[PDB]
Amino acid sequence: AHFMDVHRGMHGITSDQLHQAHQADLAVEKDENVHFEQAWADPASGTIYCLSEGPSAEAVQRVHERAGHKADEIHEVPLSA
Amino acid sequence: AHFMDVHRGMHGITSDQLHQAHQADLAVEKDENVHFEQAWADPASGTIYCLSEGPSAEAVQRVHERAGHKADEIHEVPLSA
């Protein structure tokens, strides 16, 4: 399944910090059969969007939690255009 | 510049409805040099995420308005991983 998750409150985040966070997810994602495909961040509002594939939102969130940053919101996105 | 925008209240949206909404944006995006890259929808939560390239959030929103669906939230996402 496909998921979009959102992290809020991240104002001022740098490219280095976003890379670091994404690498932390990648380091433990395979245990849960999750793959984080893309991350996009707005340092002004402090909003990070993460697109993943995995068996469930629960699995995606367990990966994030191990990586140090559980998402504030997660939605399955079964439709795409 | 790169933008992520969010539409809420789209409970129960179908694949056909998402496809047509995306087609409507694509039909008028050129005028504003806006380029919608991908859309993802969650019919359960009623959330649509739209990733685009355009000159500004103002331009992206003018396109959405013409296509009949101004986004509830729009963020420049200058960082990606």
Residue numbers in the entry:
A (entry chain A), B (entry chain B): 2 to 82
What does the paper say about this structure?
Here we showed that the 82-residue hypothetical protein SCO4226 is a nickel binding protein. The overall structure of SCO4226 adopts a ferredoxin-like fold with an α+β structure: five β-strands (β1-5) packing against two α-helices (α1-2). The N-terminal four β-strands β1-4 of one subunit form an antiparallel β-sheet, whereas the C-terminal β5 swaps to the corresponding β-sheet (β1′-4′) of the symmetric subunit, completing an extended antiparallel β-sheet of five strands. Each asymmetric unit contains a dimer of SCO4226, with a buried interface area of about 1100 Å2 on each subunit.
The two subunits of the dimer are almost identical, with an RMSD of 0.14 Å for apo-SCO4226, and 0.29 Å for Ni-SCO4226. Superposition of subunit A of the apo-SCO4226 structure against the ferredoxin-like fold domain of these structures revealed that the overall structures could be superimposed, except for the extension of β5 at the C-terminus of SCO4226. The hydrophobic core is formed by residues Met5, Trp41, Tyr50, Leu52, and Val78 from both subunits.
